């Protein structure tokens, strides 16, 4: 997959 | 710069409750996500919590899901870890830490630790 | 699942140079590590980041010496020049959707 911006939205 | 201090770190009975305390300054608190991050003596890195910056959502290892919890308060600069039903491999010693992740983009990048409490359950 | 893999031991000689891998498990190859180092009896310090393209952002104060780069799923760190004090355990990071993902960590032992 592709990692999010950041993990704790 | 950042500055990341730790507090509340003690002895506890097997089954009891603690809570460990983040004093946060140098930066705007409630625009970044803060984490917890623990080590048992001797081992490795193991991550235990993220809250957003708003507060509004909390994240949680499966290893210390439904036992600890994780809250800030965004006028004190403070983030919480709230620990319930410690178990004796809840020993270690717990950082405090704050990971950018993507944006930033250059000195925004980096990541900060704190210089972490130790947490000791125990009979 | 999202596993950073590091031998748990490395050596070279002082003044030599010594590169640590951290290799993302498959299907994360293009993911952004962080590097944070961690001598004994302290707690760690972040180095720098990581993403395909090599590239940093390096932490306050963190020595030339020091550099990362970047191959496929595996990313570095560099250390020329060893001294006495770079003998420590050395943590590659990243994140997932809801989560961080820690390397067991390299212990860097320095020769000579």
């Known amino acids: 997959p592709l990692q999010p911006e950041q993990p704790f939205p | 710069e950042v500055q990341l201090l730790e507090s509340g770190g003690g002895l506890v009975q097997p089954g009891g409750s603690l809570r460990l305390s983040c004093a946060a300054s140098?930066?705007?608190?409630?625009?970044?996500?803060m984490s917890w991050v623990r080590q048992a003596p001797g081992k490795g890195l193991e991550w235990v919590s993220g809250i957003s910056g708003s507060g509004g959502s909390t994240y949680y290892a499966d290893s210390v899901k439904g036992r600890f919890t994780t809250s800030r308060d965004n006028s004190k600069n403070t983030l919480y870890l709230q620990m319930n039903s410690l178990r004796a491999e809840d020993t270690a010693v717990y950082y405090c830490?704050?990971?950018?992740?993507?944006?930033?983009?250059?000195?925004?990048?980096?990541?900060?630790w704190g210089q972490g409490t130790l947490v000791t359950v125990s009979s | 699942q999202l596993v950073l893999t590091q031998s748990p031991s490395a050596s070279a000689s002082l003044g030599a140079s010594v590169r640590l891998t951290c290799t993302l498990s498959?299907?994360?190859?293009?993911?952004?590590i962080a590097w944070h180092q961690q001598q004994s009896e302290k707690g760690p310090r972040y180095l720098m980041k990581?993403?395909?393209?090599?590239?940093?952002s390096k932490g306050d104060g963190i020595p030339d010496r020091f550099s990362g780069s970047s191959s496929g799923a595996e990313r570095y760190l560099t250390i020329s020049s060893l001294q006495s004090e770079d003998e420590a355990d050395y943590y590659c990071q990243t994140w997932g959707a809801g989560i961080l993902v820690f390397g067991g960590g390299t212990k860097l032992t320095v020769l000579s």
């Open positions: 990581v993403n395909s393209d090599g590239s940093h």
């Open positions: 830490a704050k990971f950018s992740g993507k944006d930033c983009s250059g000195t925004s990048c980096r990541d900060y």
């Open positions: 498959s299907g994360h190859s293009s993911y952004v």
């Open positions: 140098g930066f705007t608190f409630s625009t970044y996500a």
